[PDB]
Amino acid sequence: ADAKTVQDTVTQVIEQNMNGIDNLMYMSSNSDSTGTVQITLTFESGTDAD
Amino acid sequence: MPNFFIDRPIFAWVIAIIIMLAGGLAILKLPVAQYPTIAPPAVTISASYPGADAKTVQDTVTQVIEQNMNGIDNLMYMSSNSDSTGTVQITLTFESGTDADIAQVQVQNKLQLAMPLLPQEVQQQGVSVEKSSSSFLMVVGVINTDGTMTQEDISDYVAANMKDAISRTSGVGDVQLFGSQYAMRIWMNPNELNKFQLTPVDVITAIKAQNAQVAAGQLGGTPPVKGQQLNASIIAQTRLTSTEEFGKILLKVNQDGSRVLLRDVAKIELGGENYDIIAEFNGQPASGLGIKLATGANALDTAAAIRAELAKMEPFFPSGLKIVYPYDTTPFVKISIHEVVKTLVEAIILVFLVMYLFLQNFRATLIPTIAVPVVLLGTFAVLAAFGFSINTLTMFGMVLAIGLLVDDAIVVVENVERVMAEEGLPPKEATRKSMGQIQGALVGIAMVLSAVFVPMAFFGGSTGAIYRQFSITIVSAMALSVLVALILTPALCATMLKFGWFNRMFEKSTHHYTDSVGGILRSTGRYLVLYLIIVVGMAYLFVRLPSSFLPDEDQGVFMTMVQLPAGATQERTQKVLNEVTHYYLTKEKNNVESVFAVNGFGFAGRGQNTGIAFVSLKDWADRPGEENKVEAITMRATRAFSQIKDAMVFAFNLPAIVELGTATGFDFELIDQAGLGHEKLTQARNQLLAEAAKHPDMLTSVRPNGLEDTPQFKIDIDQEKAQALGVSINDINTTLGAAWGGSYVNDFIDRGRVKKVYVMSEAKYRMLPDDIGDWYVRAADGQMVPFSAFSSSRWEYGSPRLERYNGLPSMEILGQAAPGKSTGEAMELMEQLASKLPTGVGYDWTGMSYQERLSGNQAPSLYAISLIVVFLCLAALYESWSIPFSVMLVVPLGVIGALLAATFRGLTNDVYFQVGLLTTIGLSAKNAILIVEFAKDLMDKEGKGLIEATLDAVRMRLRPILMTSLAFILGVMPLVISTGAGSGAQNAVGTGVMGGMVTATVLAIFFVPVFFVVVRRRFSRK
């Protein structure tokens, strides 16, 4: 699949659900053209990575 | 310290600044929230199996996943629900400090390995693990005010655009949709399609083929051949995106060239996902959004932030869809913390008035008006220092402690207007002497108050946290108070220090009194005997008084709870819901604001035959008469609703702490323990029940908290007869299923969003048993066959909701204490009634009634240590295994009168009372300690009289007592003891302190000097 067929199908669904996780600072994602997602959540300096 | 601090005065102005400035900085960091956390953590796993039923769902899913909940740390108990709506919910509760975040991982993780053993239809719906916490910050409604949009329509908009919009806003915790999100509804016709010799299977496997999504390579990319020049991505099949495209699905093509589209076999609207729960608000279609806390967010700040984002998207909003607000805690937390804070600003005016009209100044009164708002502000810092939060519990924490910390100021300052008047020295020099008779005695009233307080914060599980809530706050205020009374207060009043309707007038009243003490000091036992009558007072007053948890409160909303009988229907339940909704508007339009009524979700279960009506009221401002408040409206309504034929309809006020324990109730689980079946246990249940009723003396209201067996219609495929024709158990089942129950085929993309595609018989062909006929299945040779050909159906009784406790099948039983009896003894009878139930059956305690069992009585065991640690503490203040014993005897003096919230009102021994009670014992001993001290100072240092010192002691003390004590008994009763506006807890705290304060003073003044003399004389005599 390809961007508008993954960004729609996977990246949203996951992103919809990244609501309210302590010390969230900012999230960023990219779909692909080969079907490949990378959601990244960056947390506040200090926050426990585990 | 202080002596060598009233020399250094501007340093103790710094320390004042930090404390304050630090306390100010915390105010702007502190989480705000109605309550803090108090319920043990709990993880809920829930699943769907469309068209299921309690037994099926239970044996196919619930059992399975239960057999897997092992190797998870800190698990308290595990309960589960399997009900005929095709739904399971397993709820695992944890011990107390269990990290909520780790508890979910473990559960969720241990589930992930049971998944393989679940049925493909369920793995598909997905199973959810998530932290349960029925503490909602609010619930926006989204109605349509044109009638253009339906339930399902409105829900869809709400999902598409605003949902995430909210979910991302300034710390919201979780948003839940009160609706679907459109689903490609394919609504089959058995007849339209028995014609073309087709089943739902043929229909299903088409939807798969036509609505799939294929893959194929690129062009170059993967190793290409030399000097390629183009690289691009092939784009094969991809999902249908319209009701239109779905209509066109090659279902059949026969000799004729016949073209049988899905269109020609069913309706194809774009409806809701599940169709069995009907949300309307003031009579018209509605959808919702229930937002949650957010772990360290600001309840007021995100309350604002929601309304902002809702406004930042109020244009766009089609046709005419209002956003509405049937539930917001915020209002409550506001005009309840806007009070409290008033109590602080006010009980300040008081400790300037009952100070100036007594000392007479503008510079003596300006000192504790600089001291209080510091210890206070500074106390915030200490809260924030242990995570704590601005919240109802912690708020009244301080209010309920203001008297203890005003008395630390007043005491210091006026104990100089003593010293500088006899041998009258200057400021910088008399404060140096006064801060010497009291000095070490505050450092003892500190330790003393550290016990009789800290010993909370140590109580049981659930309700033990509420206690800590007050505990830390008070001990934090209290100790931070002494801390300024040694550092700022003296330094302060040894600087800035040196009406007529008094003075000479108090000057004589001291004398009339001081003499009364004398003489009541010669027999030395006319009053000692009087005391034993007071100690009996309280000791019998104790037992008499009913006990409670937290008194309910007008919160501005309440619930009507409607329940139709056994077989009743959705529509049939709607009719009822309406009357309810009708009654509330037309017949209560002077209190009722709205009726958000949900038709489908009930209490003891779900199903067409149950509902709830959330009703939200007008302002407190606009609901003035006590008969316009809640315990009024509900009382009327509950009666009013006795004109309904079959349809039990209650209305009750929700308890203060929503996500927490309840009535003096016990929670009883009747387990099974052997092969014993559903029925055997149903019988077993029926004994303990019927028995429990024979004893209304030990009181009761015992009751199954579950559902009774219903009839159900069993079809039954004849296996052989099936083989005989060309008919496959699979083709059979699917059809009967998907038609009657609905089946979820796959997904498609609707306006840039993945959404489900369901497939089931139009309602017309799936209602009555006589409707089975309609359905045909294509057999081996290819001839449509009728259901009667391979099956036969009898009616029979089953359970729409089978329940289990800790893996073994349970039936939970609710029940009430007794009008005279203790929650504890109602239990104790129950266990006995249980022990005689037919071999196999067992019981267990859960809920509050477990949080009770495993948290003994404690209070007597804990204060037994406080007490010991007071006598131990108090001896060392003086120097005697005797003298301290005089100070203690004050305990009961505050109790009586405090406990006389039986005679001046009808209330209950509750958490607020209990802490109010402690605040009072606090000033009581404080008095006693300063007295027994003043009597020991000028008796060991001045060698004065075995009785003469005790007369010169209660002389010097009588003035502080009166000042601070009037200060309290006024400002501890502004709207406190007399409210109705988010009140309840207000009257609760205050009343206990008022009457307790009255008796703790108008009585210790005579008794503590008696106490100091009655002791001493017993020791050194033998």
Ligand SMILES: CN(C)c1ccc(O)c2c1C[C@H]1C[C@H]3[C@H](N(C)C)C(O)=C(C(N)=O)C(=O)[C@@]3(O)C(O)=C1C2=O
């Ligand atoms: C009881 N709850 C507060 C409400 C209130 C009003 C509502 O309008 C609704 C709910 C529950 C939710 C649950 C959701 C759930 N989820 C969003 C898929 C869900 O799994 C179901 C289900 N029972 O399978 C729904 O019926 C559901 O679609 C639904 O119809 C609801 C909705 O109609």
